[PDB]
Amino acid sequence: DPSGYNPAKNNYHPVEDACWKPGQKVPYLAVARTFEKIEEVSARLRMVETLSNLLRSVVALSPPDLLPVLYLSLNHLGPPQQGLELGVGDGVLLKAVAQATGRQLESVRAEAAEKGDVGLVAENSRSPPPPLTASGVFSKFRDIARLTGSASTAKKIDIIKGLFVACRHSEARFIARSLSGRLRLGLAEQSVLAALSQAVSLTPPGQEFPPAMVDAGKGKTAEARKTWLEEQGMILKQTFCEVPDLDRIIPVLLEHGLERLPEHCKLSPGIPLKPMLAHPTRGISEVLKRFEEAAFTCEYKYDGQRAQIHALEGGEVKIFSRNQEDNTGKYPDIISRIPKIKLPSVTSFILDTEAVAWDREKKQIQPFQVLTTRKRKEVDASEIQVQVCLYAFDLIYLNGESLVREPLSRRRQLLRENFVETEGEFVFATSLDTKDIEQIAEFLEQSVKDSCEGLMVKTLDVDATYEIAKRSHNWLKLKKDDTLDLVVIGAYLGRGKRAGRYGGFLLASYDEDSEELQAICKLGTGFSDEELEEHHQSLKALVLPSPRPYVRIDGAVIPDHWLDPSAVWEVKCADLSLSPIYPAARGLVDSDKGISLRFPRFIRVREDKQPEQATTSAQVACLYRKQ
DNA sequence: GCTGATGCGTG
DNA sequence: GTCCGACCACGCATCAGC
Ligand SMILES: *P(=O)(O)OC[C@H]1O[C@@H](n2cnc3c(N)ncnc32)[C@H](O)[C@@H]1O
């Protein structure tokens, strides 16, 4: 009976405590019940142990189902480079829920909005189908993803409808949450990998049934078992960091075990790697304190796309994003300039660059906003209007050899010798090797004058290995980063923990000339759970049927609930930006723009102030001009 | 072909 | 103070209904 499956129990037996038989398909109810127990407890150690217990049972009884269970737990359809997209959100899902239940769409939409979760609407509104299996549900997910073109939505909903029909207990709750993209399991790539290494360590794969070894850490002490499990997890995470492909890792892991996995999987071009990231710093003094005496280089903080350029032995080139998505079609201009950025001796590499929009007429750098207007579909180079300049700063791979273990001085050296620069097309990142504080400060202000967001600071020899998929403390960011009183003119219904309350708010400034409230930004950060739920009734009493005549929101998202302009909030923001969406001070700085708040954050309520005493739109334009 | 609703990516 | 999972804003992209 899969409805009683308790993978959170102590002394879990991968065979006797499982809700299915050997050689039999893993039921999806076992996965859903694993999701329930993971969410009921808060200790992330117990959430990993509960997921491992399911994986141990999968490994022991139904090994071919390990890959679908992992992807279902990660809410992914496959390898990130494959580019498989469901094309399903809340809109298609509620249409399927209303169609399966025979209810109207607005009644289902009203319920989904009030309860805040679409999975609760599908579960409660339940409307003889065989029991769902893990690989069966996963195959239906990939089937929904393959449907494209005209009249594909109805075909997607039909697959979803048949799923909701076969759903029992909490299966519909987690299928709807997964299809909406918000599974909210509490575990992701780090925790799912942790549970997998624990599973194959406790219940080794490749055994004859019945498995003679079910708890390999039985006689170990608590510390010894913890130490042995921590190092086994480091083997899997180190191998997966270099080969982030579950389609490749899992088959070899099941056949040769975890300890022999590094001998079969090696870093090579063609498989995208999660790039190295940096930690923010609050100033140059913190940089030198954290770096102690380690020599560092100062690099420009570029405002573009992190592009991983893979050149395969033979001549094939692929461009990958930071999220391991293939962008080779988005950049045909970069593909055509590959032969003129390297020496003839270069036959294979993995480049770590920054794709920055380039004004070829002015020989200047354009902001990231101009880069986002680039077509992302299959473009041809002749129609590219926003050219890009490549800014390389690291070399992961060169001519069959990996350089992740070499220091940055060795990697930067091999990058400057084997690659040739072309102005406005491919150049090395503007760097400066120095220890003088005054020289770093001038380099930083220079960086801003060249339309960059600051400085990247990286160690050169001490702790200077390329750390894949890691936000390192050996890379530091020297970035450039106002209090305003805005009127709450609308509310947005919340999800997740804010399901039954408000999750966002539409703020507005006061325009003195037209005597109108102009929307300026959206706000949902800076709130404690207490001051949100304890004050949600105060804003709920301000709900208006229709917006006031003096409220102007223009192209901003229409709020779910219009609120009577009466609440004035003190809001802090990193900086101000020109927005083609918000109408606040539209014609006071630019002719057809307006000013919004970048990363706003709630501070306090200003009950002493009234909407007409809020920060004026002229005051907003003055703050932007002072930037 | 147009429009509005809808989905997706990444810094 | 560090790690981790979840979220997002604004751009392009996709599609239902006409
Ligand atoms: P900011 O907090 O906006 O983050 C900047 C991101 O861009 C990457 N990046 C820009 N420029 C470089 C260089 N020269 N070297 C390495 N990384 C760079 C950062 O890693 C951040 O992801």
Close Cβ partners of A207 (under 8 Å, ≥ 6 residues apart): A60, A213
**HEC sequence for A332-361:** HHHHHCHHHCECCCCCCEEEEEEEEEEECC
Q: In angstroms, rounded to a whole number, what is the distance separating the alpha carbons of residues A264 and A284?
A: 44
Q: In angstroms, rounded to a whole number, what is the distance separating the alpha carbons of residues A416 and A228?
A: 42
Q: In angstroms, rounded to a whole number, what is the distance separating the alpha carbons of residues A91 and A153?
A: 10
Q: In angstroms, rounded to a whole number, what is the distance separating the alpha carbons of residues A329 and A325?
A: 11
Identify the bridge partners of residue A422 per DSSP, sorted by sequence position.
Answer: A426
Using alpha carbons, list the distances in angstroms from residue A584 to A315, A482, A495, A617, A618. 51, 16, 28, 6, 9
For the CA atoms of A250, A253, A259, A261, the dihedral, rounded to the nearest 10 degrees, stands at -70
A553 and A506 in contact (C-beta within 8 Å)? yes
Using alpha carbons, list the distances in angstroms from residue A212 to A201, A202, A229, A271. 14, 12, 20, 37
Single-letter code of the amino acid located at A608: D
Q: Do the domains A12-75+188-256 and A81-179 sit in the same CATH topology, yes or no? A: yes
Using alpha carbons, list the distances in angstroms from residue A450 to A51, A163, A430, A444, A455. 50, 55, 10, 10, 12
Single-letter code of the amino acid located at A173: R
Q: Which positions 56-95 on chain A have a beta carbon less than 7 angstroms from any atom of strand C?
A: 87
CATH number of the domain at A303-428, please? Answer: 3.30.470.30
A617 and A585 in contact (C-beta within 8 Å)? yes
Task: Return the closest-CA partner of residue A301 out of A330, A281, A323, A327.
Answer: A281
Question: Which DSSP string corresponds to A273-318?
Answer: -PPPEEEE-SSHHHHHHHHTT--EEEEE---SEEEEEEE-TTS-EE
For residue A468, give the DSSP letter: T
Three-state secondary structure call for residue A492: strand
For residue A397, give the DSSP letter: E
- Is A161 known to be catalytic? no
Tell me whether residue A184 is exposed, middle or buried, using C-beta atoms within 10 angstroms of its C-beta: 0 to 12, 13 to 18, 19 or more: middle
In Å, how far from its chain's centre is CA A214? 36
Does the domain made of A483-626 have the CATH classification 3.60.110.10? no
From the CA of A472 to the C1' of C11: give the distance in Å.
29
A12-75+188-256 has which fold? DNA ligase i, domain 1 (1.10.3260)
Close Cβ partners of A570 (under 8 Å, ≥ 6 residues apart): A483, A484, A485, A602, A603, A604, A605, A606
Q: In angstroms, rounded to a whole number, what is the distance separating the alpha carbons of residues A131 and A123?
A: 16
Task: Return the closest-CA partner of residue A91 out of A152, A155, A174, A179.
Answer: A179
Does the domain made of A281-302+432-479 have the CATH classification 3.30.1490.70? yes
- H or E segment to which residue A143 belongs: helix A134-146
A55 and A202 in contact (C-beta within 8 Å)? no
Task: Return the closest-CA partner of residue A423 out of A457, A462, A389, A387.
Answer: A389
Resolution, Å (one decimal)? 2.7
**If you compute the radius of gyration of chain A from its CA atoms, what whole number of angstroms results?**
28
Whether any strand B atom is under 7 angstroms from the Cβ of A280: the reply reads no
Identify the bridge partners of residue A306 per DSSP, sorted by sequence position.
Answer: A354
For residue A376, give the DSSP letter: -
Backbone angles phi, psi at A477, to 5 degrees: -110, 130
Buried b (16+ CB within 10 A) or exposed e, A328-343: bbbbbbbbeebeebbe
Going from N- to C-terminal start, the domains of chain A cover 12-75+188-256, 81-179, 281-302+432-479, 303-428, 483-626
Task: Return the closest-CA partner of residue A394 out of A385, A381, A407.
Answer: A407
Buried b (16+ CB within 10 A) or exposed e, A295-317: ebbbbbbbbbbbbbbbbeeeeeb
Using alpha carbons, list the distances in angstroms from residue A476 to A282, A321, A409. 10, 21, 16
As a whole number of Å, the end-to-end CA separation of chain A is 64
A602 and A573 in contact (C-beta within 8 Å)? no
Query: What lines the ligand 1 site, CB under 6 Å?
Result: A 277-278, 299-302, 306, 354, 393, 429, 453, 456, 477, 479
Method: X-ray
Superfamily of domain A81-179: DNA ligase, ATP-dependent, N-terminal domain (1.10.3260.10)
- H or E segment to which residue A159 belongs: helix A152-166
Backbone angles phi, psi at A424, to 5 degrees: 70, 20
Task: Return the closest-CA partner of residue A3 out of A15, A23, A16, A19.
Answer: A19
User: Given the structure tokens 């995470």, which residue do they identify?
Assistant: A237
Whether any strand C atom is under 7 angstroms from the Cβ of A192: the reply reads yes
Catalytic residue among A156, A274, A301, A318: A301
